[PDB]
């Protein structure tokens, strides 16, 4: 089996922290309790001083994509071991099926390539990128066989993903028959299009254009239209990497107003901002091209982290989408060309922990709510992940929240050659970190095999996303006006 | 000549009032001061106890525009006599053009049917319901030669006169180019398009089914989209008709950063509200029907006239578009049917001064400004209306505000045979109307003949609206940054 | 030990919902989990179709307090065992300690009151009605040795309870140097007093009277000000019986920006409305009076359930402070002697059920947490009560989410002989409700005994309150600038 | 007499600009039109490409006072040529009575003081530092008789001018009995005295101290509690030096709620920002030091500007105190000795044009109404000053808008031997100061003698500013419901 007793430290789920040892035997974690016994042949780790807390689950990833003329280069294998190495158990990855391509195809090609490299366990969401009874029930079997209840549409991506208005309002309402969340990127694409012709045609060809063409506006707008739609259908919704402050006070206001939308910040939008794309060194401001942009006002990255603190932003992704120097480079003369996309599986969790918990924005409780819990509840398996309880599975992470650790790209596990917190000093490191009921990774070393993680199948119908829903439909009927004709 | 003296009144004009006559020669203010001599042969009007005020200028009307199958009721002639009986001394009326038709050619169409009925000063908006080479160039016709610099975009009539992001961008883009401000009719198409559909499919056919289709959230997001668009061009915006909370706190946010945007209120959305559409009787529930709905929140009258008092709105227009009872009636089955419409071009100066001045929420000063002064600085015809002072135009209203008058179809001057203001008492009668220094309205009754007024041709760039729109383009410029290659 | 099998419901907790049975033994729950054998001679309650949830914590009541010249009539016996019928099993009770008394000796009396006299468990908060070094002492004394971690201070009832900015900000300097949280009753004293003389003067000596001498932003005024002392000595605040849109949005406002501050809306604020002050029937607009007032914006409770929902607001209690009809009498001739205070210990539950969860507001889970657990988490008692879990102690509720039950004061159980809630139907029924292991009110009937509930004492330094606080006072330091002199 | 003719310029009112000549005969404009005669022996002032504007009338300003134990080193002479230097042609200045003393006595002495010193006109606000029945009638003879519709009134300085909240309200009532303003320093004085108290006790004794014990919250809550109070009264308010944004959005939000409250932001907070209190030179960081206090947030000035170029806030003024190096140095070992006051009456003009106009956030004629005439129209003299208009007063500036000047120490007119504007190159340039018709500063030098300027004595009920109370009086009275005893 593996037993392991992982003793002295004080466990830390959503709702409290208490002292007790933990018991993982076969997968899965046994007992909670003080004291416990250690089995004879079980390994002890010592979590005197340290958090016992649930692995980490990164909601947003794309390892391995093949996309703007490259492919990321932080694949499923390397991917997954950078996200251990950073106490980070899971992933959800984005099949980006193609314009007319099949969605089981695509959802195939991805288990068939991540499958067999997998060092965690991982699960997936579905782009819908065009529209058709073809596509409709592919997602009803996606949703009801395949393990995904997830499905993800853009705004933005003219030409290449974008959906339209009407096409979003049936996508949408047959995301609400399936039981799935829709997930939206929020920016309104012709903007993007007419602005980056704008930024090329005055000569401003460096990343700052890439900002320019797109400011904060473009994606509010966008933001607020997506809700606007799921609203009117009543179909959930999740805004995935929310970039900016007006972005993100779209989302407080319509969940005040109790629309049922999520908002999803990343490493990079916690961490930093979009300063850097005026860097005077091309490869520099290069690393942190992204679609939605990185914002130029300092006071972002705070704002959303107190906003992340307040549950205005209910949980946290990375949106890992490497691509090293050279593939940067294919943009040198014209940004529209630098394939989009930033780091951050790996050092999510400690920026988040020193940004957010040793900053005094948020508690040790609302960090494992951010960074797993609340995962699970959307994409609908909690508490078998997110949560330190009997019967949960074993994917565990001994955090010295006191320790500092530099994050840099020379100590990075990641495949980059580059980090956009370079230089970061980060309250908040994982010690060791459980995956499956094993030691994956423990004194700065890596003991893990391409292929160890499972793929988490879900059902539909989640119930944090969905009771609200379902009680609406029952009570929020419109009802006619009885008239004489 | 026609000489007429107005003498003893307090005149009211958007910056301060004063006692003070006012003489008028050949169509013209010619002296305002105390005391004045009356020149032999010319009328005295007795202003004692009365304010002198600027004629209403109504910014938004529709006098017998064919649409929805039929023609509207109150056409130019009876609809500008309506207007003088109520101390609205111009109207701006909309040429609405159809798809794939010449922008030149319904202009002309417009000025043949207006120029020999209208009793009133008045001028024109252009619809830009379609975009192509020719239709650019017509723009710049009607803004340097043809007299109007404002031009009139759709977001709704999904198949009839809307346009999508990029046909908006590229509209907005070439109205700033000609001078013209962008007006907008800012709900969503697609979402109407599609909850129309489901509120017949669910047998919501009544006026309650035209609402619950396009709620306020349609009307909010694509007032807010507008405004990015404009923003990304810098092209001036002014929202028509805003009729709901939420979009005009999407106007009043806009405003306060600093975005070139007005917004309009009407008539309708100031003194009344959308729990009309439930009423038990169809025909009562159909009056009510226009495009943007009027909304079941009570609280909305009330807010937009504490917003319009503020100036975060702006001014005042009717959207007048009326259409009888056995019109409605087209619609008795099928909401979708009704023609779109109310009425307002008389009753908008009284209830404006019963909701917003009688009440305390804004001062007669404020009244000016949101009834003649802004409009006719926002159209380009400043001071020469909306101002009681030397050399500006004699289109003059003697104002009773301690009077109170009922608003009723019964006494009404509008062709159209119910007012959805009846029975309303209204503080504030005008009791004198002047229009080209000639008295057209006085004891009750109208003495005015078709074709007495005239088409006011205004020229592009009014400095109200485009003074910070040319200095943000001379410092506003996006700059590259100097990098090694 | 009495044993009880709760077998065949859904156990709700706040952060999920699962079926599976609950063993409760000796006052505790001991199992939670599927098909549980039936020990001989346990109890089996058939939780077949039901929820099982913890029982409501009421935060705010006044059990037979003596105020405005008469006292309570709802007192501790009577009291719990109406909040027992009603689904709650704890309430917290105000020590309300006058001017110039011994904090412990108003404690002892308490204590002395309720002790012999509680059907449920009950704890204590301590008002700070005025300031010294004898308070000082007294308030260390209470938090550390009597159990206490709430103090309550007053803005309103000046010469009465109100402190002065001065003294509020030495008193939640100490409140926040003995680990307590500081409660506020925000409304300001000064334009209440003034408020209520002029509305005499006027004539206006009914309750429409009381609402008009301080309406909102009275209330909104003085929650603003106890947030900015608070914040100036980082001291933990809990706003109590927030009544009002414009009060919850200051609290909204402060805790996004990342204060540490909790409001607590009450049933009557989420139930009712202010309306009812302006009732022809004196007796009838009576009942509602309190401080702050219920207000007469419909709009009201269900925009504090929306808040309650997204944790703008946190949770909920009664403010139970009942005067019988001929009570409120003393001021048939003049408001400010009608003793103020309504009920609501015994329909809170499904007040909020109905209004919050049957409308499609908020989930079950969020409904457990804002009826119980977070009440557990901020007075520092969670798990221990507020969850269905091993160890956790057996106050738990077996409710019917589907059937109604019309609430009136014919059939409830308060003493008081009106209700504000009459003629209301809920759904959401408490059919069984377990008080420390004993079920005390089954089949309509209550079966419990005058003193049967215990004091809860508990500790300072509540984590869910406070571990932001520390943090913030490690790293959120003032520095000096370093200079040459 | 001395006739001037100010010819070939563009004239700028509030209202629109327009090219006009400009007669000006014995202290007054006497016509103003195209192609003007030169009057034998007038002066002709060629102000071809200039803007010819109404004065600046800086709300604002406390010439030599006495005060935290030395004297301002402006005083009415000085102070008022500086101001003549810098386009601003009146100055309000405040009469600081002490608690205990005569409001007449301190007046009279202000009278005195100043009429034979000022250089430009000028007029008084009186503050109101204790309260009595004296103090009442006080008000009464200075509102009727000597000319003062402004009272001042303080919230900060605690045992020394402060006032508590019942004594406001009571102050507060009795100016809208006698028709003037209340104007307030909006700072809670027991957060002041206690967080002084507590950044001395943490050796912070350097200006940083000044700052950070009084954070923009308490200046925040503050300006809400004044408004509250002076909502209850119906009494119109003024919140003088708003150098906050969020006291400045507690201002926009009463405003857009109808609630009568002007805001006055000042060129300090208008110009530069609180991050000088942590400059390493002490000099230099105690040069801002004035309370409430600049902030250390960076977009608070540009933030500042876009509310006053939207009417959140209204006017601007100087608060001129001003104190030299060795004076502030006073302070050197304690910043709560360090004199509290900033420069700014002569360069409020330039600041503005540069950081308002240039920038492209209000245009040239909103620069008008935010530097004179909104200041005539609220305390009363407009359209005698703040507009270029037959009959008005000759004050008049010849602008050239193009041109630059950098603000220096090194060039200023002030007597203080610091200027908190170091450095900043300013477009808008007065090129031409005209005073009550006369030329007093050109070609860079002044020709003005003390006491050249007169007092202006206003008349109580301003209608800018009473028209709506009025109105509200009128119709807003609360009424008793009609009961059966
Ligand atoms: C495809 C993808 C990758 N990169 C990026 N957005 O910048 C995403 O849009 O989220
Ligand atoms: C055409 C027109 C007419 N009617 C309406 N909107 O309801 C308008 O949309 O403004
Ligand atoms: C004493 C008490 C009772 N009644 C009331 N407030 O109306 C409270 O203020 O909360
Ligand atoms: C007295 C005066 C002077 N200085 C200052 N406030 O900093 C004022 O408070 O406005
Ligand atoms: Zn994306
Ligand atoms: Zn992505
Ligand atoms: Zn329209
Ligand atoms: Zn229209
Ligand atoms: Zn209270
Ligand atoms: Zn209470
Ligand atoms: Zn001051
Ligand atoms: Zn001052």
Same mark, same amino acid.
């Given at each position: 089996?593996?037993?392991?007793?992982?003793?002295?430290?004080? *466990?830390?789920?959503?709702? %409290?922290?208490?002292?007790? &040892?933990?018991?993982?035997?076969?997968?899965?974690?046994?007992?909670?309790?003080?004291?416990?016994?250690?089995?004879?042949?079980?390994?002890?780790?010592?979590?005197?001083?340290?958090?016992?807390?649930?692995?980490?689950?990164?909601?947003?990833?794309?390892?391995?994509?093949?996309?703007?003329?490259?492919?990321?280069?932080?694949?499923?294998?390397?991917?997954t071991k950078a996200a251990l190495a950073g106490g980070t158990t899971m992933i959800l990855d984005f099949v980006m099926t193609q314009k007319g391509?099949?969605?089981?195809?695509?959802?195939?090609?991805?288990?068939?390539?991540?499958?067999?490299?997998?060092?965690?366990?991982?699960?997936?969401?579905?782009? *819908?990128?065009?529209?058709?009874?073809?596509?409709?029930?592919?997602?009803?079997?996606?949703?009801?066989?395949?393990?995904?209840?997830?499905?993800?549409?853009?705004?933005?991506?003219?030409?290449?993903?974008?959906?339209?208005?009407?096409?979003?309002?049936?996508?949408?309402?047959?995301?609400?028959?399936?039981?799935?969340?829709?997930?939206?990127?929020?920016?309104?694409?012709?903007?993007i299009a007419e602005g980056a012709k704008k930024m090329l045609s005055l000569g401003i060809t460096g990343p700052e254009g890439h900002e320019l063409?797109?400011?904060?506006?473009?994606?509010?707008?966008?933001?607020?239209?997506?809700?606007?739609?799921?609203?009117?259908?009543?179909?959930?919704?999740?805004?995935?990497?929310?970039?900016?402050?007006?972005?993100?006070?779209?989302?407080?206001?319509?969940?005040?107003?109790?629309?049922?939308?999520?908002?999803?910040?990343?490493?990079?939008?916690?961490?930093?901002?979009?300063?850097?794309?005026?860097?005077?060194?091309?490869?520099?401001?290069?690393?942190?091209?992204?679609?939605?942009?990185?914002?130029?006002?300092?006071?972002?990255?705070?704002?959303?982290?107190?906003?992340?603190?307040?549950?205005?932003?209910?949980?946290?992704?990375?949106?890992?989408?490497?691509?090293?120097? %050279?593939?940067?480079?294919?943009?040198?003369?014209?940004?529209?060309?630098?394939?989009?996309?930033?780091?951050?599986?790996?050092?999510?969790?400690?920026?988040?922990?020193?940004?957010?918990?040793?900053?005094?924005?948020?508690?040790?409780?609302?960090?494992?709510?951010?960074?797993?819990?609340?995962?699970?509840?959307?994409?609908?398996?909690?508490?078998? +992940?997110?949560?330190?309880?009997?019967?949960? &599975?074993?994917?565990?992470?001994?955090?010295?929240?006191?320790?500092?650790? +530099?994050?840099?790209?020379?100590?990075?596990?990641?495949?980059?050659?580059?980090?956009?917190?370079?230089?970061?000093?980060?309250?908040?490191?994982?010690?060791?970190?459980?995956?499956?009921?094993?030691?994956?990774?423990?004194?700065?070393?890596?003991?893990?095999?391409?292929?160890?993680?499972?793929?988490?199948?879900?059902?539909?119908?989640?119930?944090?996303?969905? +009771?609200?829903?379902?009680?609406?439909?029952?009570?929020?009927?419109?009802?006619?006006?009885?008239?004489?004709?």
């Amino acid at each position: 089996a593996g037993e392991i007793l992982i003793k002295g430290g004080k *466990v830390v789920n959503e709702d %409290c922290s208490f002292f007790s &040892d933990v018991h993982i035997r076969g997968g899965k974690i046994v007992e909670v309790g003080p004291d416990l016994r250690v089995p004879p042949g079980a390994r002890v780790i010592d979590a005197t001083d340290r958090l016992v807390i649930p692995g980490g689950i990164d909601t947003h990833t794309h390892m391995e994509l093949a996309f703007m003329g490259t492919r990321a280069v932080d694949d499923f294998h390397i991917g997954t071991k950078a996200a251990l190495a950073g106490g980070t158990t899971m992933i959800l990855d984005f099949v980006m099926t193609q314009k007319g391509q099949s969605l089981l195809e695509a959802y195939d090609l991805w288990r068939k390539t991540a499958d067999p490299k997998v060092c965690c366990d991982y699960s997936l969401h579905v782009a *819908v990128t065009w529209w058709s009874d073809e596509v409709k029930d592919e997602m009803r079997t996606l949703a009801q066989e395949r393990g995904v209840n997830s499905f993800k549409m853009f705004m933005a991506y003219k030409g290449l993903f974008m959906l339209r208005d009407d096409e979003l309002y049936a996508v949408f309402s047959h995301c609400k028959e399936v039981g799935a969340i829709a997930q939206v990127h929020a920016e309104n694409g012709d903007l993007i299009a007419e602005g980056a012709k704008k930024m090329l045609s005055l000569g401003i060809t460096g990343p700052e254009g890439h900002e320019l063409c797109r400011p904060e506006a473009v994606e509010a707008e966008a933001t607020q239209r997506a809700i606007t739609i799921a609203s009117a259908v009543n179909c959930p919704l999740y805004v995935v990497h929310v970039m900016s402050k007006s972005a993100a006070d779209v989302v407080s206001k319509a969940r005040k107003d109790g629309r049922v939308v999520f908002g999803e910040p990343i490493a990079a939008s916690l961490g930093t901002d979009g300063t850097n794309y005026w860097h005077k060194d091309w490869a520099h401001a290069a690393q942190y091209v992204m679609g939605p942009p990185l914002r130029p006002d300092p006071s972002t990255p705070g704002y959303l982290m107190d906003l992340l603190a307040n549950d205005d932003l209910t949980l946290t992704g990375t949106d890992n989408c490497t691509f090293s120097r %050279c593939q940067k480079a294919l943009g040198k003369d014209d940004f529209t060309r630098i394939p989009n996309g930033v780091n951050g599986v790996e050092d999510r969790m400690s920026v988040i922990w020193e940004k957010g918990v040793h900053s005094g924005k948020m508690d040790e409780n609302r960090f494992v709510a951010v960074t797993s819990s609340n995962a699970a509840k959307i994409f609908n398996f909690y508490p078998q +992940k997110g949560r330190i309880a009997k019967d949960s &599975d074993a994917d565990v992470v001994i955090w010295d929240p006191k320790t500092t650790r +530099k994050i840099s790209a020379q100590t990075h596990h990641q495949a980059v050659d580059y980090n956009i917190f370079e230089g970061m000093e980060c309250h908040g490191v994982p010690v060791v970190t459980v995956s499956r009921g094993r030691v994956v990774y423990e004194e700065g070393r890596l003991k893990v095999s391409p292929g160890q993680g499972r793929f988490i199948h879900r059902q539909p119908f989640s119930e944090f996303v969905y +009771k609200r829903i379902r009680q609406r439909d029952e009570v929020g009927k419109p009802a006619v006006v009885i008239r004489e004709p």
